[PDB]
Amino acid sequence: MQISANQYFEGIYAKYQNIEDMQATINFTLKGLKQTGVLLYKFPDKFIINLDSNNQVFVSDGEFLTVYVPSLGTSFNQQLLKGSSGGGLMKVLNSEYSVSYTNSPNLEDLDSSEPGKYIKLTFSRKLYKGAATINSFIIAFAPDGIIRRITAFPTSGGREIVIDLTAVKFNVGILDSKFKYDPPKSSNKVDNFLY
């Protein structure tokens, strides 16, 4: 009912404040390649991605993104979003970016401003909170606040990172001991090998 982008995002933010975890089929593009697997997100700020097409594993504690390369016996980590104060996707969007409707307040196609089923929000970095390696996101929401696509625009001007989430399910269960989300002691720090 004439809802502004900020009001719409308040509802999204509040929804995700009351969810314990998320499982999703994930497709994402990095370094010119499509990766495909399963995302498990432990709110507010932890996740693991197990890939289908190779044995690599991506883990984030909200500060570092670690990539395990088991065929080599080691792992590599970079900052998830250098410049950010972290705290998970929603906190970052809510505190370090200003939100607007990408095209309109109306329901649109994922790809165009034609009619479709999605609300699309643009998050533009507040540079008075510091520069970051990602200066904007465009996020498409399906009608129950479910994320369908996150497009991340590197500040470098490199290729956009397109993240497609499907088969989204909430509160599947992830025992707190199951997973270690920070880089292991043996991990190798690398500057920005992904974005």
Ligand X SMILES: CCCCCCCCCCCCCCCCCC(=O)O
Site for ligand X, rule CB under 6 A: 28, 39, 41, 45, 47, 58, 62, 80-81, 88-89, 92, 150, 152, 161, 163
Closest separation in Å from C-beta 177 to ligand X: 21
Q: Where are the alpha helices (DSSP H) in 73-178?
A: 89-96
What is the spatial distance between Cα 76 and Cα 187, in angstroms, rounded to a whole number?
6
The CB-nearest residue to ligand X is: 89
- Identify which of residues 105 and 160 has a Cβ nearer to ligand X in the complex: 160
- Identify which of residues 27 and 103 has a Cβ nearer to ligand X in the complex: 27
Q: In terms of DSSP bridges, do strands 74-79 and 188-189 run parallel, antiparallel, or are they unpaired?
A: parallel
The token pair that represents 99 in the structure block: 């939100």
Closest separation in Å from C-beta 166 to ligand X: 12
Q: Where are the alpha helices (DSSP H) in 33-125?
A: 89-96
- Identify which of residues 96 and 108 has a Cβ nearer to ligand X in the complex: 96
- Identify which of residues 32 and 115 has a Cβ nearer to ligand X in the complex: 32
117: left (phi over 0), alpha (psi -120 to 50) or beta: alpha
The token pair that represents 164 in the structure block: 């497609």
Q: Name the residue among 19, 68, 14, 49 with its Cα closest to residue 170.
A: 19
Closest separation in Å from C-beta 8 to ligand X: 18
Closest separation in Å from C-beta 51 to ligand X: 11
